[PDB]
Design a protein around this ligand. Structure first.
Ligand code: CDL
Ligand code: PLX
Lengths: 69, 57
């Protein structure tokens, strides 16, 4: 029965080791992502949570018919 | 000996040769803040896929 239907215990051992490693990395990545999102929403200096401003190319730098401006 | 200007002459854009230095900052502007640095490097596939709940990709 063992020869025909099942395998050795080392197979399951190493499989669950790999599964545990994968899940641990995923958990760490999730926590790091939450922290990064919080920090970049608070500060706004990151790529995410960038809100549009007024483009400076719309300004007209020419004489305005009055000397002051 | 004065000649009256013709039509279209007094409305010309004329050059002026002066000695007054060109102002460096006529608007008295402050120092512009440093921008967000850049996006750098090539794109690599996401580690362990979406990592959303039980989905493995
Ligand atoms: C039924 C509805 C639920 C399941 C839908 C199918 C899964 C779709 C999916 O989102 O997969 C993501 C993901 C992919 O699975 P995987 O472990 O990467 O697949 C093995 C590799 O692709 C390695 O597998 P592969 O590349 O050898 O297989 C290729 C292809 C084999 O197809 C062929 O060979 C055709 C010839 O896959 C299949 O056809 C399997 C049968 C379908 O599966 C899951 O996340 C499991 C969760 C699914 C449940 C979601 C919520 C369920 C709600 C109630 C039901
Ligand atoms: C010796 C006589 C006295 C003792 C009798 C003992 C009785 C034992 C027989 C009863 C069998 C119990 C059913 C359990 C089936 C397990 C299914 C699965 O686990 O087997 C897979 C494969 O299946 C097997 O090949 C068996 C499949 C056969 C299904 C049994 C159904 C027989 C019922 C009879 C029906 C009669 C129909 C009549 C029609 C009219 C294994 O997956 P695999 O990853 O590949 O192999 C891993 C091991 N390796 C790598 C070393 C090879």
């Amino acid at each position: 029965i063992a020869r025909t239907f099942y395998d050795g215990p080392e197979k399951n051992y190493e499989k669950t080791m790999a599964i545990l490693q994968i899940e641990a990395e995923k958990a760490e990545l999730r926590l790091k992502e939450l922290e990064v999102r919080r920090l970049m929403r608070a500060r706004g200096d990151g790529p995410w949570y960038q809100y549009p401003t007024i483009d400076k190319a719309l300004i007209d730098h020419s004489p305005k018919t009055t000397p002051d401006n | 000996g004065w000649v009256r200007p013709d039509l279209g002459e007094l409305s010309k854009v004329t050059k002026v040769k002066t000695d007054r230095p060109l102002p460096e900052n006529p608007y008295h502007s402050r120092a512009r803040p440093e921008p967000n640095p850049e996006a750098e490097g090539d794109l690599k596939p996401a580690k362990h896929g979406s990592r959303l709940f039980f989905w493995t990709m």
